[PDB]
Every structure is written in C-alpha cells, then in structure tokens.
Design a protein around this nucleic acid. Structure first.
Ligand code: MG
Ligand code: MG
Ligand code: MG
Ligand code: MG
Ligand code: MG
Ligand code: MG
Ligand code: MG
Ligand code: MG
Ligand code: ZN
Lengths: 208, 150, 185, 129, 87, 81
RNA sequence: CCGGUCCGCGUACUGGACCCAGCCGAGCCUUUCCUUCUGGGUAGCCAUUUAUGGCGAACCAGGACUUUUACUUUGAAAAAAUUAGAGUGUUCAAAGCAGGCCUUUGCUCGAAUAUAUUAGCAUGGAAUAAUAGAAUAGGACGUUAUGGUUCU
C-alpha cells in the first residue's frame, strides 16, 4: 500500500486550512461530488483535505515516473499562479508555461515554442482550457488542480483545491515540488524541513 | 398513463414489504370483521372502511390481519353491494353532470366531460360482464340511471 | 407418547414428548401444552459440534405453537444441551402438472414448491421477520439466496443462522446466506 | 404500456454498457429475463447479476465487464425452423465464428450452437455478441 | 487470432481501457497511458518501476477519468478511503 | 459515475429519494398513539389521517385532515408505534 | 496411446485407449408414481390354509378414460418432367441414361440421392403465448365406505 510516513501530517493540514485551500466553489459539478465533505452554511463547500493530500501524493508519483524532468510541463494562465509555476520549473527542472499559451504549441510543429511534453499539469481547467484541449490531441495525460466548479473533461488526476485563492495556488505547487524531490532523494527523508518557504511561489503585486 | 387525460402522475400507495401484522397490533382477526360489518351497515364502501380502519383503528391492511381483502369479506357475508363501488361512483357523477346539463344547456364542457365518464362506465361494465360480476344482459341506461344510485 | 401424531415414534421423539409432559408443571405455560402435538423430529449434524433438531408440526397447528414458541425453545435447549431447536410446519408440495397429465383439481399456490420453500424459510427465523430477500447468480452457475432479518428480537437467533443455512440446504438442496444488515456492529 | 419486459431489460443493459457503466438496474424482472441473462453470463458477456425481491415483479442489478457489444430482443418471437436458423445467424451476427442467437425451445432457452447440438428449435428470442 | 497450425497470424494485438475495457484504437489521440512510480519503504521513488494504467479517449471525454482513477488506484492500494463504491 | 454500488446505496441518499424510487418501496408514514390533554386513552392514529378522529370517551376532535400529515390538536402528544 | 498396415505432413486406417475434460442421452431418489380395467401370472409379499388365503405393474397384450390449442422435432404422404446433385470420354460440350469386362453362342455395377411445404395425417417435447378449473362450493378422494332414486 503505502508507508504511514506518507500520511497527512498535522503540520501540512494546518498550512492547507490557513491558505484557504479547503474553500471550494459554491456550485459543484457531479464529477467533483466525491471530494466534497460538507457544505458550509454561507454556501462555500469544504474540501476533504485528506483526499486532497492523497491526490497530491499520487500526482507526485506520476511526475517522478517521467525520465526527463524537462518533459513535465506546468501551466498557469491565472495571474495568481504565474509565479508558482516558474519556481516549480526551477526547482524540479520542469518546463513552466506562465501567462498566455499560444494556440498550436502542441499541434503546430512550426510554432516558436512548440513542445512535446510527456505530461501536462494545469492550475485551472477553466482559465487553461487551451492547454488542456491540445493535450487531448497528442495523447498527453493531464493532472489538474481543480476547484468544485472546475471542469473535469480530459482530466485524469484531479487535485481538489481552491483555484481562486492567492495562497491556495502557491501552497499546492509548493507541496508538489517538495514531494517530487523527496521521491527523487533530493530531500533526505519525509521529516527534514525544506529550505524553501511557501511565500516564494506567491504572486506579488507591482507595489511590494 | 391517465386513460382519459394527458397527465402522468404517479401518486399512489406503496405497500410495505412486510406482509405480516405489526408486532404492536393486538386486535384479533374477528374483532376487525365485526368492526367492518358494523361500519358497512352505516353505508360505507370498501374504500371508506379501509380509510377509517387505518385512520382510527390502526388496521394497516385488512388482508395482513384477517387474511382476505375487504370486498372479499363483504361478499362472504351477503353485504356486497349489487353495483361495484367504483362503477357506482362513475354513474353517480354522470347522473350529477346530466342533472346539471339540462339546466345549463350551453355548458359544452360538461357535455365533453359526460362523454368521458359514460365511456368509462361502458368499458368497466363490459369488463364486469366478462368476469360475471354483472348479468350478461346488464346494460347501463342513462334514462334509468338515477334509480340505481339515488 | 400420546403427544406424537405418528405411529412408531423414535426414541428421540419420545424424549421430546417426555419434555412436553414436563414443561406444564409450572402453571404459567400449562393451559396450552395439553393440545400441542407434533409429527416428527428430524435431526442433522451441523459443524462446530452442534446438532440441529427440527420439530415438524401440522400446518393448521402452527399458529398455536407460535404463541409460546419463544419460551418453549429456551427450556427445551436447556433439557437437551448443544441442541438447536426449530419448529417447522409440514406443508405439502403438489407437483406441477404435465401437459399430458390427467386433469386434477387446480393446485393452490400454498402447495407450490416456491411457496413452501419460501414458507419454511419464514418458519426458520420465527422471532424475527424478513425485511428483504436477494438471489445472487454467480458466474460459476450456482445461485445463492440472501435473507435480511429485522434487528428486533435478533438475540434469539443471532448466535445460530449457520445452523439454518445447512438445515435449509438439507431440506431443499439450494444455498442460502442469512445476514442481519441492521445490527449495532 | 409495457409490452415486453425483456426489451426493457436489454435496452437498459445496452445503454449502460455503451456509456461505460459497470452496473445497471433492471425493473421489472421475469423468468425469461433471468434465463436470458444466464446465457449471457454463461458466455462471459456479463458478470454476476443479483435479483432483489420486493414482493412484486422484481428488480435485477447486473454487473457489466465491457465485453458486451450489443444485446437485443426480436419482437415478435418469430417461429424458427431448423433450416431457418442458418439464415437468422447470417443477418444478426457479425461473423460465423462468434456471437449467439438466443432461442426459446421446448427444451429450454439456449444459444443457436446448443440448439444444433440437441437438435431442437423453437421461437427466436434475442441475440448477444 | 491464429490459424489452424497455431501461428499467430494477428499483427498488433491492441491495448484495452482499464476502466471500460474498450479497445484503444491506433488513432485515438485522446487516450493516455498513466505511469505511476513505485515507492520503497524509505519514501523514495524507485527508478524505472511503475504501475501503469491506460484510459480510452471516450472515458476521458465524459470527465469520468478522474473518478475512474480513484477507483482503480484504491483497489491497487495506491490510495486509501478516497473513492467510495457506495454513493 | 461509471462504477457505483447500486445494491447498497448510502442510507442518507436513499432517504432523499421518492417513496416509489427506493430499492424496495416503503411508506414514510407510520401509526401513532395519541394522548389528548383532557384524558388518557390510547388511540391509534394514522400519521396521514384523512378522518377527524374523535376519542371514544368525549366527542372532541383529535385531528384535522390536511394535504399531507394530519394535524393534531393542541395538548395532544404523539408517540410513534 | 506401436501408425506396422492401409497405401510419404503421411495417418487413412485402426490393435490399444487407461478415456482428461466436454457433448447428446436414459433411468432411480429427494413430499415428485396414467387415477385405470381384464388377464398373463401369478414371483415374492403379509408365505399362520404358496405358483390351494389377499403384489396386476414383477413386463406385455387386450380393454377403459382423457381441458382445448398455437409452436417446434421426427415419420409416412406431396407423380413424372423441371431444379440441386452422385456416376457414366455422347470424340469435348449442350445432352442422354447410359454403360463396363480378352472379345465372349455370355458375364456383368446402374438408371442414385436431395428439395417440395401453406393445408391434412402420425409422432417426441412442453420453453414461450393463450385457455379451463375448488366460491351461495352444485368441489376431490374412500381402492372393499353406507344406503336411496332412477336408467342399460
Ligand atoms: Mg407512469
Ligand atoms: Mg386512451
Ligand atoms: Mg392506486
Ligand atoms: Mg398450571
Ligand atoms: Mg467465462
Ligand atoms: Mg439483412
Ligand atoms: Mg458464429
Ligand atoms: Mg463477443
Ligand atoms: Zn380523550
């Protein structure tokens, strides 16, 4: 199965709730129903972060199976996630796609940034619809960070989280980066504190 | 559904899976029968006796207690009405509409509804003749209907 | 031996009737054991060292036994240790007529094989009532019944059920599994 | 009204299998439905199925394993002579090497291959492949 | 498919979907092949040693791929109490 | 949802279904023992009663029929049987 | 399972399967039996008086009854010609039903076989679809149950 060292620790659970990861959208589609624990009386849906954690561990194990780390593409069209994917690529060696995704990057082989990723990871199925659509043309599996209103079409691994949160996006990306390196052996074990802080991967306004 | 309408309603009773009397039921199969005969002489049809039984006596089903359905018990004690209850109420309604129509001759809606009721009477009376509930020569007459129900 | 409604009762039937002429000593249940009779005592061996004791009763006399059956079994289990006691009615099964068979009186449904097996399946679990039956059709070809029992009065049968499955298999040849879905567990 | 409960059962199975579901609920049950399902189960086109008793016509829950391409009824249940069985399998089955036409014969419900083995014929009932 | 003498005259025995058992065609470009790394008792991913699942493009198009992986991974122990058989 | 346990539905979701749409249809009604405030006499009353039930002792209406459940009069306490 | 032989995967032939499983059956027992009548005829029951008392099923041959179908299996019947089809060097063929043998004071394979199909006839089976039955019981068994009223 899985060693107990991979269970959701209390430290990470504190991080997820403080980052408002557990806040899912008001209206949930039928495909995300298993991930909802209970609806909050204001209307927000509470995410079962125990299920969220396990999908994260499952997703990181798929990333570790790609031989060339650059062959993994991490995507974010939302401005809140642009900083997170750029730092993920630096730490893991993946290929970041921040901002606009040029249509035809996967199908048109004469475009400038024509890539052939073995795996595409998406921050949001709604704002990254173009990146997800082309992956369904060239046999690319998709891992997606999904809210309760995020579409689940052509999404193989769904990470239930809050897509519309400034801190939620950065934390989930930080958690994936840490686990991928733990499996690769960069982090010595599952108890050593990581040098990188979740504040890095957070979007900063032009004010600072 | 709805032989004489465009409705598709599904409302009806849903009998429980258990076919036995509830553990809390204490009346005997006899005391219910004398209760039924007592109410039957007051003029209640089998539908109304069953309504009173569950409403006021806790008899969920007369069949799960006595072993026989309500109409079967009345026919066994010579208390079965000559006209079956459902056929009686269709004819009575047709009598009421026909009585209303002769005073309101321009009421073409009541004329349309009367045809439906009488068509429903004829289908049911024809059925009752094949099952020998009515005599083979039994025929519903609009002129003499008031005698049968009034 | 007058309790037995069969000629030449076995020694086990005599011992059971000997118990029947001893439980009326206490007057709380005596006004009803004079008329009680039975036809046979079928006994089979179940796993675990126990033995199943089946008391066969005339079907019209079944409702009289049902009034005192809960008590009567408890003392009969005391007199005969390591014995599981059930009360069954001797329903008659009439074979399905052949097409060329000479005409007889119309066979009532209570005499059909389906009804009788459903009936003995109901007498087996008497204190509880059946709230649902399911039949599994396995890929191997065999078919297994599942009977769901009410949690009320469950303590009277909750330690057996395994005796019932083998007893039902002996009487009919088919496989059944008894489950109480609504236990506390 | 409801004129063929077998047609309702197979349509529900077809709709669930085409949509990728691995289970389907069938209402109402009947002897013909159960014996039709047993033939499908016998050839491996479906898995285990379960009968639920509700003191009525009944219900069935069938587990689908994705091997079923199509099952259907033939309404009405035409009379089939032994010499006509060859013509029916050509029209209904995709090939001469697999697939079965289900018949109801006085020897019981069986596939067209079994019907030739025991040299019986009846009315056609359906097909499965 | 093989002839009378037993030789496999079939070329290209195709793959089948892990969820629905449909055949994945040669030009079904919405179909993917998930590769999931095995993890040793030290918490390390074992290099080049994977649990593999395949999904047809049909399942992925309906949006049921995510829920199907939850079921498939839970039966293989890759996940615990995330997918429920009874809904 | 492609895979789902149809034979063992969640009892929570099973209770939200229409009374004819369960696995085995089952009435949601029940029978009650009604204590009027005036006296103490067990009277079995159907939950969805269509009759203005009166207790035998005093000719006082215990309940009034409605569209659904019958409405017990004030001072009347019910216990489900 | 010697493939010797038969006439070289050969492998047909065929001793020999020891039959793995599978397939088409037939009975017997499970609450499940043509209710039957007249023998054979009586052999073994109930052998206390047998094949001199009361096992008619211990299988036939001679009688008596029978809910009605539909359906499907098999059989007889559906003229020959025509059709499909076996054989046959009309010099080939279309055809035809011929013909072949060491050469004959004669010998001698044949002239098949299938198909007909609604209706009728006989037959096995009893799924499917109808149909009848015991409700004011005017209902069923008593094999040797007790009488009475009629009729042959
Ligand atoms: Mg409807
Ligand atoms: Mg109409
Ligand atoms: Mg109704
Ligand atoms: Mg006493
Ligand atoms: Mg198989
Ligand atoms: Mg055609
Ligand atoms: Mg074939
Ligand atoms: Mg097939
Ligand atoms: Zn009162």
């Amino acid at each position: 199965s899985l060693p107990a060292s991979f269970d959701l620790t209390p430290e990470d659970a504190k991080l997820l709730l403080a980052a408002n990861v557990h806040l899912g959208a008001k209206n949930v589609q039928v495909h995300n129903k298993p991930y909802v624990y209970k609806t909050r009386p204001d209307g927000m849906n509470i995410i079962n972060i125990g299920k969220t954690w396990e999908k994260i561990v499952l997703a990181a194990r798929i990333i570790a199976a790609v031989p060339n780390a650059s062959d993994v593409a991490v995507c974010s069209s939302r401005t809140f996630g642009q900083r997170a994917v750029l730092k993920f690529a630096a730490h893991t060696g993946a290929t970041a796609i921040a901002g606009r995704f040029t249509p035809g990057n996967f199908t048109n082989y004469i475009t400038r940034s024509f890539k052939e990723p073995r795996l595409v990871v998406v921050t949001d199925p709604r704002t990254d619809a173009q990146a997800i659509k082309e992956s369904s043309y060239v046999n690319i599996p998709v891992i997606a960070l999904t809210d309760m209103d995020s579409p689940s079409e052509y999404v193989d691994v769904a990470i239930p989280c809050n897509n519309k949160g400034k801190h939620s996006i950065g934390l989930i990306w930080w958690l994936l980066a840490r686990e991928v390196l733990r499996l690769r052996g960069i982090i010595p074990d599952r108890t050593t504190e990581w040098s990188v802080m979740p504040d890095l991967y957070f979007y900063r306004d032009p004010e600072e | 559904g709805r032989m004489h309408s465009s409705g598709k309603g599904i409302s009806s009773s849903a009998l429980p899976y258990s076919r036995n009397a509830p553990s809390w039921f204490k009346l005997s199969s006899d005391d219910v029968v004398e209760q039924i005969i007592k109410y039957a002489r007051k003029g209640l049809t089998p539908s109304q006796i069953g309504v009173i039984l569950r409403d006021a006596h806790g008899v969920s089903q007369a069949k799960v207690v006595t072993g026989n359905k309500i109409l079967r018990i009345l026919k066994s004690n010579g208390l079965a009405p000559e006209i079956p209850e459902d056929l009686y109420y269709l004819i009575k309604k047709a009598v009421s509409v026909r009585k209303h129509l002769e005073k309101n001759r321009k009421d073409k809606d009541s004329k349309f509804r009367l045809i439906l009721i009488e068509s429903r009477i004829h289908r049911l009376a024809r059925y009752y003749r094949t099952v020998a509930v009515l005599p083979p020569n039994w025929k519903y007459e609009s002129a003499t209907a008031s005698a049968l129900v009034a | 031996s007058s309790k037995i409604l069969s000629e030449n009762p076995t020694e086990l039937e005599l011992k059971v009737a000997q118990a029947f002429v001893d439980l009326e000593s206490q007057a709380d249940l005596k006004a009803e054991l004079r008329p009680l009779q039975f036809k046979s005592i079928k006994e089979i061996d179940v796993n675990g060292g126990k033995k199943a004791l089946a008391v066969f009763v005339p079907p019209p006399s079944l409702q009289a036994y049902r009034k005192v059956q809960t008590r009567l079994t408890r003392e009969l289990e005391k007199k005969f240790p390591d014995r599981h006691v059930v009360f069954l009615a001797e329903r008659r099964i009439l074979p399905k007529p052949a097409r060329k068979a000479r005409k007889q009186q119309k066979r009532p449904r209570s005499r059909t094989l389906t009804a009788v097996h459903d009936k003995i399946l109901e007498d087996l679990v008497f204190p509880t009532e059946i709230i649902g039956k399911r039949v599994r059709y396995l890929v191997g070809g065999n078919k297994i019944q599942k009977v769901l029992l009410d949690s009320k009065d469950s303590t009277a049968v909750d330690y057996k059920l395994d005796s019932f499955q083998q007893l039902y298999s002996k009487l009919t040849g088919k496989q059944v599994v008894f489950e109480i879905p609504g236990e506390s567990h | 009204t409801r004129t063929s409960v077998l047609a309702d059962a197979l349509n529900a199975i077809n709709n669930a299998e085409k949509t990728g579901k691995r289970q389907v609920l069938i209402r109402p049950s009947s002897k013909v439905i159960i014996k039709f399902l047993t033939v499908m189960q016998k050839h491996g086109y479906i898995g285990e199925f379960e009968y639920i008793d509700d003191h009525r016509s009944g219900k069935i829950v069938v587990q689908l394993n994705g091997r079923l391409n199509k099952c259907g009824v033939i309404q009405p249940r035409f009379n089939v002579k032994i010499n006509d069985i060859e013509r029916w399998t050509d029209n209904l089955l995709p090939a001469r090497q697999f697939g079965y036409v289900i018949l109801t014969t006085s020897a019981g419900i069986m596939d067209h291959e079994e019907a030739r083995r025991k040299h019986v014929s009846g009315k056609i009932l359906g097909f499965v492949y | 498919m093989e002839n009378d003498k037993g030789q496999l005259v079939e070329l290209y025995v195709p793959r089948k979907c892990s969820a629905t058992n449909r055949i994945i065609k040669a030009k079904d470009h919405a179909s993917v092949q998930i590769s999931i790394a095995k993890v040793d008792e030290d918490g390390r991913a074992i290099a080049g040693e994977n649990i593999t699942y395949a999904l047809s493009g049909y399942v992925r198009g309906r949006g049921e791929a995510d829920d199907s992986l939850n079921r498939l991974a839970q039966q293989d122990g890759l996940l615990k109490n995330v997918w429920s058989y009874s809904r | 949802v492609l895979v789902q346990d149809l034979l063992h539905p969640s009892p929570a979701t099973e209770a939200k279904q229409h009374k004819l749409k369960t696995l085995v249809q089952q009435p949601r009604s029940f029978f009650m023992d009604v204590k009027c405030q005036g006296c103490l006499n067990i009277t079995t009353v159907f939950s969805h009663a269509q009759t203005a039930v009166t207790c035998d002792s005093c000719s006082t209406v215990l309940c009034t029929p409605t569209g659904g459940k019958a409405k017990l009069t004030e001072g009347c306490s019910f216990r489900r049987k």
